[PDB]
Amino acid sequence: MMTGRQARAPLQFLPDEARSLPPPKLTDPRLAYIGFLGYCSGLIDNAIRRRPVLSAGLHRQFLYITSFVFVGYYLLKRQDYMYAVRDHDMFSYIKSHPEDFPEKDKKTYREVFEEFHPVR
Amino acid sequence: AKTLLHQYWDIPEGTECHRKTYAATSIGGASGLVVSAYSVALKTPTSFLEGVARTGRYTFTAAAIGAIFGLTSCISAQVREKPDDPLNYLIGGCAGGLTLGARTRSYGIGAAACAYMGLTAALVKMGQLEGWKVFAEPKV
Amino acid sequence: LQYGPLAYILGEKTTKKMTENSKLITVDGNICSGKSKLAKEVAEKLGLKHFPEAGIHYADSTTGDGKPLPVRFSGNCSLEKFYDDPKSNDGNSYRLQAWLYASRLLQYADALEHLLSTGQGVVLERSIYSDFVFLEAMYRQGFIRKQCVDHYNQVKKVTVCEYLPPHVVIYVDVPVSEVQSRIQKKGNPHEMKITSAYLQDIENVYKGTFLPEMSEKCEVLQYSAWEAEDAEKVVEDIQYLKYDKGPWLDQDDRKLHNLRMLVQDKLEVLNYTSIPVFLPEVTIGAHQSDRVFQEFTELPGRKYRAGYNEDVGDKWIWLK
Amino acid sequence: LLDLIWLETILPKTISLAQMKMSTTITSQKGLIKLYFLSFLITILISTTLLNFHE
Amino acid sequence: YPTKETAHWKPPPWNDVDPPKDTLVSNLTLNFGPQHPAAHGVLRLVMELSG
Amino acid sequence: PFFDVQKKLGVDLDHWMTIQSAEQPHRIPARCHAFEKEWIECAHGIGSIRAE
Amino acid sequence: MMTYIVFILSIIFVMGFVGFSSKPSPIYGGLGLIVSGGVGCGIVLNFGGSFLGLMVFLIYLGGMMVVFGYTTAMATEQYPEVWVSNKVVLGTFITGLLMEFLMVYYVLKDKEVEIVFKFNGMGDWVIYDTGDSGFFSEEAMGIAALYSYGTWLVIVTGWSLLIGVVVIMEITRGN
Amino acid sequence: MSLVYMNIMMAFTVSLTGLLMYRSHLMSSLLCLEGMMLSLFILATLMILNSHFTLASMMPIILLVFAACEAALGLSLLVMVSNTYGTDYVQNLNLLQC
Amino acid sequence: MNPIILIIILMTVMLGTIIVMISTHWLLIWIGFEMNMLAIIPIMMKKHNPRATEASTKYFLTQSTASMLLMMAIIINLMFSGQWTVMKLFNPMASMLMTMALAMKLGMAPFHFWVPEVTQGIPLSSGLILLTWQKLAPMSVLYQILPSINLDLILTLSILSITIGGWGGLNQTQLRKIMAYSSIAHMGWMTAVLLYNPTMTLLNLIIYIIMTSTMFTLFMANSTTTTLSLSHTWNKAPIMTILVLITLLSMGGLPPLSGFMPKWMIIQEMTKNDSIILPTLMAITALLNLYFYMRLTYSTALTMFPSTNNMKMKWQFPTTKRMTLLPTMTVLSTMLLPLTPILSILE
Amino acid sequence: KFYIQEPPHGSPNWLKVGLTLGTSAFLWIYLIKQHNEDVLEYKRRNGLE
Ligand SMILES: CCCCCCCCCCCCCCCCCC(=O)OC[C@H](COP(=O)([O-])OCC[N+](C)(C)C)OC(=O)CCCCCCCCCCCCCCCCC
Ligand SMILES: CCCCCCCCCCCCCCCCCC(=O)OC[C@H](COP(=O)(O)OCCN)OC(=O)CCCCCCCCCCCCCCCCC
């Protein structure tokens, strides 16, 4: 869809204008969900290799959680960047083409005639 | 076979039953020839005589389905005097299903194909009416 | 892990340590051939590592503390019950033979892992190429059925083709009469109930099917019983054999690398012992396997991987 | 009659038998290279002549 | 779901390895006959060449 | 996934055989050099949908 | 009809393709493909590509010599089919020949034809350029640019040939 | 377009249908793959020499390389048919039907 | 096989796919496909049995035929456009030939006839490479040429692929043919939303790669080639039965599992373009795929088929396989649906 | 002393534990450093001081 926007700055995971946006917080529930996915990954890795699931390899569980948070932070940055690009292109296109986006004259319900369909 | 479908649909329902019956017959015959071509493709018949026997059998089965379909649909549209009405194609699809069950020599496949082909032909008539797009052009 | 393709690339070729003492040698013979110490004597003069004959509890002796598990956890089979009732209704005959074939397959994998890692030849007793002869006797005496032989031939066909024969196969010529005399003098009350035709069938598939089909791919050293009592004869002949037959000659680093990779993963070794062929001798039902597996998990040192059990003294689990 | 056989017949059993029939006919292949590439030929010639997919 | 055609289909082997089906290699039988500049007048070598 | 590495790294692997209007050996022009150059300079950056 | 010489060489080209497409035997398949590859270097040479026709001649000569050796050693039966030993060879051989001369007739009677594309019927001499290329044939300079310009093309082609030898020796090993 | 492209595209279609309809014989279809590469060579080289687009004159050579660089692959995949089986008949290649 | 030669051959497979992905030139695209095929043939012949030779022969014939059709599409592009830019095509005949070539390279129906045979012939890791990594280069070419792809052709290939790959898996007890007909159905799913929104095509490609790699990694970690040997998994390591339960319920398209993500999003982009009949028929046809996934979960996790005695030995040896990224792939293939708006990283 | 064969995961691989802990600590501190630079850049490009 937006492949012509990233056709002048190719393969930039986060462009220069991505830094105009507020970053995801450290307590971001999307990022916290990815951290819980890291905890689940550590528990599955302890389970399938016949380790005690909650005790064995606290460093290994901790690096699973940390690695998922470290990848998911930049993934959320790119997500919020591309939705900001979506909204920016939408609003600039509406602002540049006024005749294709007419301001609808809102009629109030005292003029609007709706057919009444009774339930009987 | 893009224009077989066009020369079927471009004629008003319940007006000229012969040309509609022949158009649906040719659509059914083309479909039967495609089924026959893949049938001799994937499963080798025992000889060329058996191959053209299977080709003619599938072609005449599907052509009889198309013929009795177009005949029954246009005759029902004439005797009911309601062209834009998928009950006509429900009756025509049931006649085509009974045709398939007669050619395959089983009443159960005839009744099941009656029901499902009648529903299918009704849905095709409704798609012709409201303009339902099955291969829709991308707009957004 | 320790060994893999990465250690193979960086310089660890297995023919760098393959010397002429690195010879896998398997001693064969009947039930009381006197090979039981002879093989150790063949192991003690050449400096080879002796592996005793894998009974029911070889896999129990390798894992855990090396002590045998109870018979409901390993095998579900009894040798003395086979001696007392060979034609049993529950089919302990082929179930026992299948468990013995699995234990010998694990033993032969241990022999090859020792030979390819430590570079030292291994003395076995009755490796997997000599298992089937007992099976054949158990078909000739009507002890098992033909579908049991078909199941064994399928397991053998998909397992033994991945493995090499021994270098030296030491057979001992003991007739049935001296075997009977040593069993009567042996002192085991269960071992005396063996019929004579069973031992005769074992000697027949020894001398008619096993030793002919091995001699192409190894070098047999067939001896009698009195010169089996002199093991310096046997070592004295092993030290002067000219290894020219068998598929051991066309073995470079790559083929033995793939052999050492296949060998060191014991579940891949045992992958086709438990094939899904439903036979009433080996098929344990759902609730019985559930009960036995849940009892196996509750065992000391068996709940987890071999360095992750608090009950047997594995420290530092939270950093492993 | 109805709620053990016929209402049991019309939606689930006829659908189950139809999908089983098509599953047997699709996967009844002899695995020959000749018939597969002959079917590829028939597909391309239906695509050109009979469906006008090159238009 | 076995039909009439899919009834001789035995299941494939466990290790996906088939028996080698040792059909005859047909060693080409050369008649290095007596009329030859190398066979000294009278020598019929019936030889079996593998190529 | 046109992972445009060649524009990202600035290396030139196959932007040279791509059109007839490119730098040719010994400055050889094609028979349709001017037509292709005019259509490329017409359709540059205006997109496919407007360019066609 | 001498101005149509690329056309006549192309008729012999398609007749060679009918020769090895009917597949009698790879001996005669190699025969027909050598005939077609030896008239293809006469089709393409009248456009100026003498080097680039001599090479498709030479590479396919080496190819058919190797394919000869393999079909004499592997793809060999007792009675090889020439074109007439099997009716399924001869029927589609005659069919391809009659359809090729049929579309010769339909293009020299009308001077246009339309199978899928629309084709002219005048001889292809009309579309040449009216200029001279100086002291170089331009196809020679373009194929000489494979080293100065086509570095990446050289790298991927040589790497494909190296691993093609590696691939072929790993396949034909068995163990 | 020009007259010669009729017969060169016709030769591509003839080698296509020669490849795409087997005759229980694999070397005869590897020959049809080589013929399809020949027709693609002749067609692309006619167009490139027609355009005087000289820089892609190295394009058919490279094309030709990968022609034999797959066709030799077919030959190396032929002997593995013919060492297991007696011949290269494609009806011996039906063991993956179960 | 030498491990050095295995590393070289896998890097050459990756190199061919990267050359298809990054290049701007059609000859370079065709070189990438030739290099990918040539390098992947010894991955299919890793063990040297007649099944691998038959599988590699069928795969070589299909991909060589597809490469021929692809180069003819390239040459007709060269004629009717005079250039070589990997972009839209300038002739519907070349677009049809290229779409046929890529449908043969993907094994989409009615060109599907090689995927279960080649997948059944070769081992599980080479089948994994075939069903995941080889589905990347032709989908790159389909992403790059979509202003010229005919609508009715790719939609016919898509829905016929979904129906035929649905009916294919319902008669299978070998796991590799199950995953192969699943691949045919899911390539139909990927290419159906191609001309509507190809970001959803890339999303379905990524989620299918993750789920398929999870299933083949579980199959390698349990050494299972048949359904009835996958049904012995409860007696050996019962956590693997839970993992195959959650992954096979994920691949069927049940919420809250992540395999509901692509399909729904595909419908989310097909109904915007006023197509309602076609995603409805596709979604109803996906119930067949879910049916044979339910069959495999009935075999493995939900029931307990009677195992054999020698399983008692395999209790005494834990798995020492290198299970590469198995918990990560399982978590991403089951618990990613609340992160559904992450798909904008593909925009 | 229990196991008759010394298990590979009997003693902890202290090099692997050290690499795990150091890599995870570096990922956390580089993540916090990148987050602080990002909040500074966002407050700088707009002037929300
Ligand atoms: C439990 C057993 C029975 C199950 C019955 C389930 C419901 C049966 C009917 C479902 C129809 C399909 C979904 C309709 C969604 C309509 C949304 C919409 O916008 O409609 C207007 C749109 C109209 O298009 P539009 O809205 O884009 O266009 C604008 C409006 N006009 C037309 C005026 C220009 O309708 C359609 O596009 C067609 C809808 C019907 C399609 C029928 C196909 C399915 C056939 C029957 C399937 C039956 C169940 C299948 C499973 C059975 C078991 C395997
Ligand atoms: C059934 C089996 C077959 C049985 C019959 C076999 C008959 C004998 C076949 C052997 C001869 C094959 C000849 C093939 C073409 C060789 C091309 C050639 O001669 O090239 C040399 C030369 C290159 O020099 P150039 O750079 O072109 O110079 C011109 C500018 N100063 O080029 C020139 O000087 C060009 C001069 C004009 C060339 C005319 C066009 C080519 C004519 C081809 C005729 C048909 C060849 C058939 C080959 C079949 C091989 C078996």
Ligand SMILES: Nc1ncnc2c1ncn2[C@@H]1O[C@H](COP(=O)(O)O)[C@@H](O)[C@H]1O
């Ligand atoms: N495959 C087998 N079948 C029957 N008995 C066996 C088998 N393998 C080993 N044995 C027994 O192992 C013992 C070997 O004898 P000894 O060498 O005296 O320990 C005898 O009791 C044999 O019966």
